[PDB]
Amino acid sequence: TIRVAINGYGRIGRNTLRAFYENGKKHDLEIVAINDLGDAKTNAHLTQYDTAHGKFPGEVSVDGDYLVVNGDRIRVLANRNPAELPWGELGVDVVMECTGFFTSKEKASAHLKGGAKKVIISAPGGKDVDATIVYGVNHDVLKAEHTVISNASCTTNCLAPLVKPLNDKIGLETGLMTTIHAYTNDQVLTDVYHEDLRRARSATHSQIPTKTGAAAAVGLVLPELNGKLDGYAIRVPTINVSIVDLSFIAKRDTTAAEVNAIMKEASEGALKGILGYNEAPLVSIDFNHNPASSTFDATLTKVSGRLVKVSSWYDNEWGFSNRMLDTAIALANA
Amino acid sequence: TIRVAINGYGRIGRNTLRAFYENGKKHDLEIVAINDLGDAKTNAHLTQYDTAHGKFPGEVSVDGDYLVVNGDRIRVLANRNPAELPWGELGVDVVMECTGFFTSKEKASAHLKGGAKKVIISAPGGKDVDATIVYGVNHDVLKAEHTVISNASCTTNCLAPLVKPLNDKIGLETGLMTTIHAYTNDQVLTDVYHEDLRRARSATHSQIPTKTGAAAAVGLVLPELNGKLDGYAIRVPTINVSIVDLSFIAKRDTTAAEVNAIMKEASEGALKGILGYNEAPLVSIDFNHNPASSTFDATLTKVSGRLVKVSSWYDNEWGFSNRMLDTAIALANAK
Amino acid sequence: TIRVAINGYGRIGRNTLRAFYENGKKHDLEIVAINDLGDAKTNAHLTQYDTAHGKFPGEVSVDGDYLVVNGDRIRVLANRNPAELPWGELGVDVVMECTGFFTSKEKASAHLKGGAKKVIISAPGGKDVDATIVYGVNHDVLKAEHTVISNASCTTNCLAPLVKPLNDKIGLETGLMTTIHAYTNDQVLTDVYHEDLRRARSATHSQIPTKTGAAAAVGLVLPELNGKLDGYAIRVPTINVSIVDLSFIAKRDTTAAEVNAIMKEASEGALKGILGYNEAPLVSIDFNHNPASSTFDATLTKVSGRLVKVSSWYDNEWGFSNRMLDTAIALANAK
Amino acid sequence: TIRVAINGYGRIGRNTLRAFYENGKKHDLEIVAINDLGDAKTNAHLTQYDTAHGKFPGEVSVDGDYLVVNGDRIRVLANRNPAELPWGELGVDVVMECTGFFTSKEKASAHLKGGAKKVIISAPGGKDVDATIVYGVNHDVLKAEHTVISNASCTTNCLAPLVKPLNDKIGLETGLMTTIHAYTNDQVLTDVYHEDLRRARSATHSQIPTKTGAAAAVGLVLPELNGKLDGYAIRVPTINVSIVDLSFIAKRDTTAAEVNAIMKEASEGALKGILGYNEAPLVSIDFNHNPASSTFDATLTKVSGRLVKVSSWYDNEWGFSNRMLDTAIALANAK
Ligand SMILES: NC(=O)c1ccc[n+]([C@@H]2O[C@H](COP(=O)([O-])OP(=O)(O)OC[C@H]3O[C@@H](n4cnc5c(N)ncnc54)[C@H](O)[C@@H]3O)[C@@H](O)[C@H]2O)c1
Ligand SMILES: NC(=O)c1ccc[n+]([C@@H]2O[C@H](COP(=O)([O-])OP(=O)(O)OC[C@H]3O[C@@H](n4cnc5c(N)ncnc54)[C@H](O)[C@@H]3O)[C@@H](O)[C@H]2O)c1
Ligand SMILES: NC(=O)c1ccc[n+]([C@@H]2O[C@H](COP(=O)([O-])OP(=O)(O)OC[C@H]3O[C@@H](n4cnc5c(N)ncnc54)[C@H](O)[C@@H]3O)[C@@H](O)[C@H]2O)c1
């Protein structure tokens, strides 16, 4: 049994906890601490009530310094410097770093200085990171000597399972991705200063093109694809749920019907759970609270000669959060 | 001066009228008639005030059975049937069908019976019309013989100019399109009956995949790309402005900087005014009320081997409405 | 046991069905028919998936001209003239009229012509209807003879339970209401023709003021407040859930604590189930899928001298829909 | 001619700068400097483009240590300590203090030490400020000796002109306001930590109640109303524009007709420019970019006995920014 701490009890921080309980505690861990900026009442409140995901099924409360979820008691800290955190005393095996501010191995290591054994960055890591994992694809690579890994991005986790079966059973020369993405909290309501002049613009009124390493990053979860994929994102005005739209050059001739079939039985077999399959006439909100990393949408496949276009829907919060649990385990028992 | 009317006075209707006045009436034209069925107080108010395009910078009022727009008297009508409108009494050279309900050719020639010498449809027409035109790309294929033509879709109007100089100087084996598109009035506010099951879902809260013929219909304006382009739309929660995202296989080797150069040149050349060129870090709302049919975005270009991704922004209402005016001219003045 | 048909299977129609199944079919009725504009395939799809309320918890399938929900077979019709429609064949006890087009005894009686024995309008009716009902407050006025009734509006069902206990224990001279109301399907996505000049404007970008009879109507269900209340609505950019903001002159001195204590007592007693009570720091979306007709928000209470301001949240779809079932059971079993 | 510096170039700063230029530089001042910690290029871009207010109708560019707007060159500084700023070297008569973190006379006086003669806070001030001003209402109170003043808040600037005529000519016992307010950048996109638990909730999907001291603050500028008004805000999903909804007990009997005449008279004389008057059937976005502090809406007035409800629209950004210019002038010229 593994002992976990969450640093950053925000969209990904909390939804990892919510997914831990909504699953039924199958994952052989315990969440023992939780770090954010606010008091325990604040965290208790945001755990019980959510816009995107509704009210939390079970029972939540506070006990002075402790958040209590379905009987389990969880300490609530509010120290912004992770170096001075009591991870040693709590005897934490894995700190989930979900604040967005410590994404390099340099910065994330504060948790090792604090006294935690390992750390999972809820995001793409710095070049210096021990590893970058997309669970269900390359989680094998993990060794006990890995102390500071990355869990990739929500996009990367969606793209990897879409492309692997099509590269294996058809072959891809080159591919270009557009992901159309729900807005996130790094964006703004009405135009204000931001490091990126596009993310400086109102997220609720525009399509905002934005950079993302997701396509290239797949390159180094499936090394055989290294340097063969690029892409970018368009943020649109929705609260949650994204889609990946991949165009690629097939090595040989193919058809829509066949592309779909490869993806179908990929979802029914070796990628089951991770990769979903859809033929129904659904829209983005129908995948809200779907725990798949990637739900491929057969209804949108289009093939024109050697050029193939495929799409997959992903709950960028819920999909990614369920994988944070999976990858926490894998990392602890390497 | 070409004497012009409009039938259907909806978003396309009103914005075509507004387009004309906002330009400075620099089109050799005069809008002499408007044939919605809702009353005149209501249409004046919707001309004056608009959420997406803001307040009309001009004077709007009603004098009985008439509309006054910066001094000019627009005859309001109310006939359901196009065969018996007065048109030819008032010398109507070109009519504009913007309700849609009457899209095909035999229904459309009813305006000719009513007196009109020509007719422009503000939508894709049935496979049986004198032309489908994308102004600045193929409008030169017009003649005096032609009567009931099509001005295409907003999306086809954005795709054609995007693709031409790329096919012409690089060559395009095949392409697939996704247009990320603002919601429109056929959609719904909260899930309720619709003949399409995706469009029956709240427009304000989802990305909604929808079918569009606009990629195939590039064939009809650029014959050399018959069968080479396909695609669809994803409807998103914006009130206006849309982007065409195009992936295509190039016949030869290339770069992003070259694709960009070719497009800049084409924006300063034949398609000047119709096709724009952006290098600035802008978002969709920046292209709201931009009269271009297509503004290519050099910042978004990606080339990976022989696969090329280019994208162009379009105000799905405004650009198209400014082309309708361009088209109505070129229609009349062909032989 | 009473046999019910839903006419108009939209926001209130489907959610009345959904409500009926999510409450474990405790109501002594069976839903035997749905009438709308599409086929069973469309009605089943919209029953199964929803933006505002998420995925239906049970099982929905299709079998020919029958929609099947949790094993119950429900016949799907698509005729937009109630006169026709086989209510006699199906032996319907109560039609729930939820299309928005038959909101008077005269108009809604077309269902009687079609074979049904009694009708509930899902909205304010004319003065001509036999009763206007807010369940929890005046349903005891229902009589065996009454054939066509009105269930009032969402707003009236929220306001009556708010105002009643305060007028009984404190006293109310006059009162004025504003309801900040989610948009509904009678509004538009981008500016376009409508009988109402403000509702002709995008629901997604504006606060839009509109009329409501709810204040006066609280007189009809609580005669002691005849002519004392007035008010209106402001439609805002949200997909569901609304609030009533009532201001009134108290007839004696009171405090915020007393006002809250009174309402807490009423929610716990005679109006239990119809009226909830909140003192948590919540926002509109937290009341989504709350079946109460009115959830008093004690945290928002304001008294200054004799002027009192109180607020109650309501799920305009879910509250009203649960009440439609309750009122059906009261209507048929009356006497 | 007054030399004005802007400390803190967020939305308030930028919008104030734009209103100056968009009004044709009619105000007898010049903007000679801006102090902000962001980099110039970003601040230039955000001056040129805005979602809520659209594209600045002039030219904006950067040239070294200078922001350039319609030919005028504006020195850009980036120092967090205003004691060390060159205001005295620059001859700055009035700093507009727009940062948030200098709302006390004690703190603001750092600008005095830096060389500025006067400071106007774009926000309610601490107890120690020389005055609080709603332009058109109490700017007469400004005196030579005042060096650090408040311009109050956007809501107070809406409410004071609304209630002043009514109190003068009818009389107000007490009053309670709800202000239905656009969201601001102090809120969140999707639920996340905030010091207030309601603002921790998505602004884009809910009605969100929040405290404001803006009703009680009307006592600062209309001492006759001191202690008589209170209220709160409901934040709704719109990017800009808000409405003040005031309920009050009148001291004598009046009519809706009398209330409106009183406001029209006020708008055409004493408060001309600051208070507008609408009888048109308009919605919130039609007031976007309206520079009035308060536009009273005659169509919304209700009276029932001695209870009056009156509503006024305000662009909670543009109104306030225009008034900052007005007040800056009066402050520098005081006595
Ligand atoms: N939201 C998504 O779709 C998504 C998906 C995959 C990965 N991610 C990644 O996860 C990370 C966080 O994303 P998010 O959406 O949860 O952001 P968020 O803003 O919603 O949550 C971040 C939380 O961390 C807290 N925090 C900030 N500084 C802190 C500090 N110094 N110490 C402790 N806590 C601090 C904040 O108060 C907040 O509660 C980012 O790196 C992001 O790229 C996001
Ligand atoms: N809006 C766009 O982005 C755009 C772009 C390209 C093509 N189009 C096409 O243009 C057409 C119109 O679209 P819109 O957005 O303007 O529609 P709209 O719903 O916003 O406006 C249509 C108007 O026509 C009126 N109308 C309906 N039936 C009528 C009838 N029987 N007789 C007279 N008037 C009638 C309505 O009252 C309304 O005022 C559509 O068919 C669409 O496919 C629209
Ligand atoms: N939405 C609310 O919050 C709310 C609350 C209380 C009461 N109501 C009232 O209930 C009624 C329904 O409102 P709604 O929100 O469900 O509207 P809606 O548009 O969602 O529903 C109308 C339904 O009726 C169908 N329809 C239209 N014409 C028909 C015909 N003649 N025959 C059969 N079906 C037809 C439509 O396809 C649709 O499914 C209205 O009178 C409304 O005022 C609405």
TrEMBL record, chain A:
Annotated EC: 1.2.1.-
Signal peptide range: none
Binding site for D-glyceraldehyde 3-phosphate: S153, C154, T155, T184, T212, G213, R235
CDD domains, A to Z: GAPDH_I_C (cd18126), GAPDH_I_N (cd05214)
Gene3D superfamilies reported in the protein's UniProt record: Dihydrodipicolinate Reductase, domain 2 (3.30.360.10), NAD(P)-binding Rossmann-like Domain (3.40.50.720)
Keyword Mitochondrion listed: no
Record: residues binding NAD(+): R11, I12, D36, R80, S122, N185, N316
One BP annotation, GO: glucose metabolic process
Residues carrying the site annotation Activates thiol group during catalysis: H181
Active site: C154
Broad EC category: oxidoreductase
Keywords: NAD, Nucleotide-binding, Oxidoreductase
Domain Glyceraldehyde 3-phosphate dehydrogenase NAD(P) binding: 2-154
One MF annotation (Gene Ontology) recorded for this entry: NAD binding
PANTHER family: GLYCERALDEHYDE-3-PHOSPHATE DEHYDROGENASE 2
Subunit structure as annotated in this protein's UniProt entry: Homotetramer.
Annotated family: Belongs to the glyceraldehyde-3-phosphate dehydrogenase family.
Role this protein plays: Could be involved in carbon fixation as a component of the Calvin cycle. Catalyzes the oxidative phosphorylation of glyceraldehyde 3-phosphate (G3P) to 1,3-bisphosphoglycerate (BPG) using the cofactor NAD. The first reaction step involves the formation of a hemiacetal intermediate between G3P and a cysteine residue, and this hemiacetal intermediate is then oxidized to a thioester, with concomitant reduction of NAD to NADH. The reduced NADH is then exchanged with the second NAD, and the thioester is attacked by a nucleophilic inorganic phosphate to produce BPG.
Protein name: Glyceraldehyde-3-phosphate dehydrogenase
Source organism of the structure: Burkholderia pseudomallei (strain 1710b)
Automatic annotation (TrEMBL), chains B, C, D:
E.C. number: 1.2.1.-
GO terms (BP aspect): glucose metabolic process
Record-annotated active site: C154 (nucleophile)
Record site: Activates thiol group during catalysis: H181
Keyword terms of this UniProt record: NAD, Nucleotide-binding, Oxidoreductase
Residues the entry annotates as binding NAD(+): R11, I12, D36, R80, S122, N185, N316
InterPro entries: GlycerAld/Erythrose_P_DH (IPR020831), GlycerAld_3-P_DH_AS (IPR020830), GlycerAld_3-P_DH_cat (IPR020829), GlycerAld_3-P_DH_NAD(P)-bd (IPR020828), Glyceraldehyde-3-P_DH_1 (IPR006424), NAD(P)-bd_dom_sf (IPR036291)
SUPFAM superfamilies hit by this protein: Glyceraldehyde-3-phosphate dehydrogenase-like, C-terminal domain, NAD(P)-binding Rossmann-fold domains
GO MF annotations, alphabetized: NAD binding; NADP binding; oxidoreductase activity, acting on the aldehyde or oxo group of donors, NAD or NADP as acceptor
SMART domains attached to this UniProt entry: Gp_dh_N
Positions that bind D-glyceraldehyde 3-phosphate: S153, C154, T155, T184, T212, G213, R235
The organism's place on the tree of life at top rank: Bacteria
Annotated ranges, domain Glyceraldehyde 3-phosphate dehydrogenase NAD(P) binding: 2-154
Subunit-structure text: Homotetramer.
Function: Could be involved in carbon fixation as a component of the Calvin cycle. Catalyzes the oxidative phosphorylation of glyceraldehyde 3-phosphate (G3P) to 1,3-bisphosphoglycerate (BPG) using the cofactor NAD. The first reaction step involves the formation of a hemiacetal intermediate between G3P and a cysteine residue, and this hemiacetal intermediate is then oxidized to a thioester, with concomitant reduction of NAD to NADH. The reduced NADH is then exchanged with the second NAD, and the thioester is attacked by a nucleophilic inorganic phosphate to produce BPG.
Protein family membership: Belongs to the glyceraldehyde-3-phosphate dehydrogenase family.
Full protein name: Glyceraldehyde-3-phosphate dehydrogenase
The species this protein was found in: Burkholderia pseudomallei (strain 1710b)
Gene: gap
